[PDB]
Amino acid sequence: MTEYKLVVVGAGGVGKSALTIQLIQNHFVDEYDPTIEDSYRKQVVIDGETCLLDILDTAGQMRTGEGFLCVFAINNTKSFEDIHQYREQIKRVKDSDDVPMVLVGNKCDLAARTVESRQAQDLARSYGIPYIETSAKTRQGVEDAFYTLVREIRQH
Numbered sequence: 001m002t003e004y005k006l007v008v009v010g011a012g013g014v015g016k017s018a019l020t021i022q023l024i025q026n027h028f029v030d031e032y033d034p035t036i037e038d039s040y041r042k043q044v045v046i047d048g049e050t051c052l053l054d055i056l057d058t059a060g061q062m063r064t065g066e067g068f069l070c071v072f073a074i075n076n077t078k079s080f081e082d083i084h085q086y087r088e089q090i091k092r093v094k095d096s097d098d099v100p101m102v103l104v105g106n107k108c109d110l111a112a113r114t115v116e117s118r119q120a121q122d123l124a125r126s127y128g129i130p131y132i133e134t135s136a137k138t139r140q141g142v143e144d145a146f147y148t149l150v151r152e153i154r155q156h
């Protein structure tokens with residue numbers, strides 16, 4: 001019935017699971033339980049089409065994915081620097097450079113920012129992908145991030 005397999009990747013603790021839970025269940029996960037591999041399904045209407053989102057939430061501590069959210073946290077410079085390695089791993093497993101992706105800078109509700117918006121925009125630009133900032137806590141940008149990924153998949 002038209003399904004999209006979205007894979008969420010990124011360093012430990014950047015908020016992959018909190019983002020996913022906010023999207024699917026509309027509440028914020030405050031505690032930190034490291035993930036191994038969890039998947040969720042949700043039926044939603046995106047741009048006039050009823051579809052099934054299968055979201056694969058991965059460990060920060062891929063073969064089946066149609067699009068990838070590459071997540072870092074804006075108060076976590078190491079997680080941003082790690083993005084290069086995550087994208088390379090994705091391309092290694094997919095054996096292609098033509099993989100739908102969105103770059104996500106999470107935790108934008110926090111003030112200890114060490115990754116400036118412009119730096120992330122430039123990274124995304126070099127990859128030919130959108131950059132979207134999010135807060136799993138406030139829900140800001142969460143729908144933008146996941147729905148923009150769906151819209152990118154539809155372009156490939």
Ligand SMILES: Nc1nc2c(ncn2[C@@H]2O[C@H](COP(=O)(O)OP(=O)(O)NP(=O)(O)O)[C@@H](O)[C@H]2O)c(=O)[nH]1
Pocket residue numbers: 010011012013014015016017018019029030031032033034035036058059060061106107108109110134135136137138
């Ligand atoms: N302030 C704030 N805290 C957040 C945000 N997203 C996640 N967190 C917090 O960061 C911690 C880790 O979140 P989590 O979703 O488990 O991260 P993860 O990327 O899934 N970790 P792992 O790779 O180990 O599974 C939790 O305490 C969570 O509440 C956010 O947008 N804002």
Ligand SMILES: O[C@H]1CO[C@H]2OCC[C@H]21
Pocket residue numbers: 012013014032076
């Ligand atoms: O997971 C949270 C708590 O610990 C920090 O480490 C990086 C991610 C942050």
Ligand SMILES: O[C@H]1CO[C@H]2OCC[C@H]21
Pocket residue numbers: 023024042044143
């Ligand atoms: O809330 C938005 C973002 O997530 C979707 O799930 C159902 C409603 C949609």
Ligand SMILES: O[C@H]1CO[C@H]2OCC[C@H]21
Pocket residue numbers: 029030031137
């Ligand atoms: O307490 C941690 C876990 O949840 C976030 O909310 C703001 C502070 C962060």
Ligand SMILES: O[C@H]1CO[C@H]2OCC[C@H]21
Pocket residue numbers: 030031032
């Ligand atoms: O302890 C820190 C790191 O992990 C979060 O969980 C809730 C409190 C936050």
Ligand SMILES: O[C@H]1CO[C@H]2OCC[C@H]21
Pocket residue numbers: 032033034
């Ligand atoms: O139980 C606490 C201490 O260990 C972590 O693992 C998952 C839940 C967290």
Ligand SMILES: O[C@H]1CO[C@H]2OCC[C@H]21
Pocket residue numbers: 017018021029031032033035038
């Ligand atoms: O793994 C997801 C689903 O359960 C939440 O609790 C902690 C991590 C979150």
Ligand SMILES: O[C@H]1CO[C@H]2OCC[C@H]21
Pocket residue numbers: 033034035036
């Ligand atoms: O949360 C951590 C600690 O225990 C493992 O079980 C599944 C998730 C892993």
Ligand SMILES: O[C@H]1CO[C@H]2OCC[C@H]21
Pocket residue numbers: 024025040041042043
């Ligand atoms: O199956 C759908 C409906 O409820 C949500 O919780 C996790 C998966 C989502």
Ligand SMILES: O[C@H]1CO[C@H]2OCC[C@H]21
Pocket residue numbers: 009010058059060061062
């Ligand atoms: O190795 C890290 C980076 O990608 C995820 O896939 C499974 C384990 C996670």
Ligand SMILES: O[C@H]1CO[C@H]2OCC[C@H]21
Pocket residue numbers: 011012013014076078079
């Ligand atoms: O800094 C290392 C240890 O914590 C992880 O979070 C993102 C960066 C990773």
Ligand SMILES: O[C@H]1CO[C@H]2OCC[C@H]21
Pocket residue numbers: 085086088089090092
């Ligand atoms: O394994 C990760 C870290 O190093 C990159 O090399 C290709 C796969 C990527």
Ligand SMILES: O[C@H]1CO[C@H]2OCC[C@H]21
Pocket residue numbers: 028030137138
């Ligand atoms: O999760 C609790 C603790 O922090 C607040 O932020 C929004 C939800 C509230």
Ligand SMILES: O[C@H]1CO[C@H]2OCC[C@H]21
Pocket residue numbers: 108132133134135140141144
């Ligand atoms: O802050 C969130 C909510 O709205 C979007 O605009 C830019 C960042 C995203």
Ligand SMILES: [Ca+2]
Pocket residue numbers: 027028029030
């Ligand atoms: Ca909560």
Ligand SMILES: [Ca+2]
Pocket residue numbers: 091092093094095
């Ligand atoms: Ca390969």
